[PDB]
Design a binder for this molecule. Structure first.
Ligand code: HEM
Ligand SMILES: [K+]
Length: 248
């Protein structure tokens, strides 16, 4: 149900050039996972009932970076500031979401469709909307479903974003990568979740909750068996996530 706004030709030209520049920058800096986390934490605050929060540029605000769920993301924001400055026409909202999309692409992931025109909004959402890694399926549904308005399928596919990167004991407290290949976007997050705890790889309780829920488990299996299917459903869910509250 989207109606995307019209942006000028200059704005579109800027999108295209920023996209390229973000590829090169994110690849060199090895920071795709962090950039994915930044985009996801920007969008993930959306509350459908109130139409508050969501991917509207507020994560750049020190007040939103201070939320405990956002530990470390001040790094991401600082990393992007000089590039963003080359693209003054673009909203921060658009820029961060583009960086999330590129993160996925340059690590070998699907091409998530991108539509410009998000406006930067002045008020960060209240803290406490992003998910708690120590909780389970009900909580996931409360956050992704009742707040954001995404689907059960979307929940499992987006969990797959842990296919890249790692936790840090100084940020969340959790530590290490979910996968043996943490800068490669693939279905390894699901294959590892399926094979049990292997030494040196991370599983959050929230990842584990996928295995015991009657709706989530068949999806984990599908994605572990079929990376093409994971990529399709991941791209659908990321696009939706990046557009929460935008163009409705
Ligand atoms: C489903 C509920 C989720 C929970 C409970 C959760 C929790 C976490 C936690 C605790 C970390 C560790 C942060 C650190 O210590 O550095 C993390 C990292 C990460 N998360 Fe999630 N997350 C979830 C969903 C997602 C989603 C939906 C995405 C994107 C589609 C995502 C992408 C990432 C990425 C890429 C990292 C690694 C960041 C890095 O390498 O610095 N997460 N997540
Ligand atoms: K991987």
């Amino acid at each position: 149900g989207k109606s995307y706004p019209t942006v000028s030709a200059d704005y579109q030209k800027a999108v295209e050039k920023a996209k390229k520049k973000l590829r090169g920058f994110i690849a060199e800096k090895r920071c795709a996972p962090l950039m994915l986390r930044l985009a996801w934490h920007s969008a993930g605050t959306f509350d459908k009932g109130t139409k508050t929060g969501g991917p509207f540029g507020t994560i750049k605000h020190p007040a939103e970076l201070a939320h405990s769920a956002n530990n470390g993301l001040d790094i991401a924001v600082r990393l992007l500031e000089p590039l963003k400055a080359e693209f003054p026409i673009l909203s921060y909202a658009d820029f961060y979401q583009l960086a999330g999309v590129v993160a996925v692409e340059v690590t070998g992931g699907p091409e998530v469709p991108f539509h410009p025109g998000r406006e930067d909004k002045p008020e960060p959402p209240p803290e406490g909307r992003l998910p708690d890694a120590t909780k389970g399926s009900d909580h996931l549904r409360d956050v992704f479903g009742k707040a954001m308005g995404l689907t059960d399928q979307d929940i499992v596919a987006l969990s797959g974003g842990h296919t890249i990167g790692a936790a840090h004991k100084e940020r969340s407290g959790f530590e290490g990568p979910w996968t043996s290949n943490p800068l490669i976007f693939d279905n390894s997050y699901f294959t590892e979740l399926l094979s049990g705890e292997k030494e040196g790889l991370l599983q959050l309780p929230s990842d584990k909750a996928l295995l015991s829920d009657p709706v989530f488990r068949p999806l984990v299996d599908k994605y572990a068996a079929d990376e093409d299917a994971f990529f399709a459903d991941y791209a659908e869910a990321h696009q939706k996530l990046s557009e929460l509250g935008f163009a409705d």
